[PDB]
Amino acid sequence: HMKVDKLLVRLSDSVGYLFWDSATTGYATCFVFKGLFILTCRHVIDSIVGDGIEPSKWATIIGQCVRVTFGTNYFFVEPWFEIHNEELDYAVLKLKENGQQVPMELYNGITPVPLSGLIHIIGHPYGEKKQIDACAVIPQGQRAKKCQERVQSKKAETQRSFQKIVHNPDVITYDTEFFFGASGSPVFDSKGSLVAMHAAGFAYTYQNETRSIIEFGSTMESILLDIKQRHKPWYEEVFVN
């Protein structure tokens, strides 16, 4: 369908390339969540700050070492780091206005989480050009079976490893090229409505190729509930008011 394809091209203007150069250098994907606030994965912030830094200083380091481009066209973020979560692997940052127009926010209400079918992901695999990809949902009930099949096929040449996606309705699973460094990329359902944020996969190297057993992202519903419970005053000023 092309009306959805034209919609996803429009939405892709809200998907950003996050770059950092701190003690290390790297990139990730992010997207405008609500207003000036962007979303990315929590493990990305951990890579920016690195290990052994007091929490009082993360906001200053983030403000000093992060830049975001949605295309001199870039945004800094505010030295502010308060809404985030390790298990759901999300982090909110706030863009600093600089006269350039902020792209439209992508959170557009309570999209149902697709239990099967097709989803779309927008982001920057390999830290290169922005891409829009279509992926098939892997239903929850087939996750454990899919993982063992593919591990055994390779060994032909356990499930304690995968037991963070097995009974987790808070994630969608799928197979995507966005495994290659596009963590933080927003995930859309077949209508082009924001449903999730791509998180990670299960990396391994086989015949000198880096591959992944399965990929997953945390649902917007689970992220928003966490924000609603843990940061109710912030939720009401940003989402309600």
Author numbering: 343 to 413, 422 to 507, 516 to 599
The authors write:
FAM111A (FAM111 trypsin-like peptidase A) is a serine protease involved in multiple cellular processes including antiviral defense and DNA replication. FAM111A contains a serine protease domain (SPD) with a conserved catalytic triad (His385, Asp439, and Ser541). The FAM111A SPD belongs to the S1 family of serine peptidases, which includes chymotrypsin, in the MEROPS database. Here, we show that FAM111A is a dimerization-dependent protease containing a narrow, recessed active site that cleaves substrates with a chymotrypsin-like specificity.
Therefore, to generate a mutant SPD that would crystalize without forming the α1 dimer interface even at the very high concentrations used for crystallization, we truncated the N-terminal SPD to remove two-thirds of the dimer interface and included an engineered V347D mutation to create a construct that we have named mini-SPD. The mini-SPD crystallized with two polypeptide chains present in the asymmetric unit. Although helix α1 is still present and visible in the electron density map, the dimerization interface observed in the full SPD dimer structure is noticeably absent. The catalytic triad Asp-His-Ser (in this construct the catalytic Ser541 was retained as wildtype) is unchanged, which is expected as they are anchored on the rigid beta-barrel domain. In contrast, several disordered regions were noted in the mini-SPD where some of the residues comprising the dimerization interface, several surface-exposed loops, and the oxyanion hole are altered. Residues 413-422 that form a part of the loop L4 between β4 and β5 were disordered and not observed in the mini-SPD. Another region adjoining the β6-β7 loop (Loop L6, residues 474-480) is also disordered in one chain and altered compared to the dimeric SPD in the other chain. The differences observed between the two chains of the mini-SPD structure and the dimeric SPD as well as the higher B-factors observed for residues 536–538 encompassing the oxyanion hole and S1 pocket indicate that the monomeric SPD is more disordered. This suggests that dimerization of the SPD is associated with a disorder-to-order transition that supports the oxyanion hole residues in the conformation that is competent for catalysis.
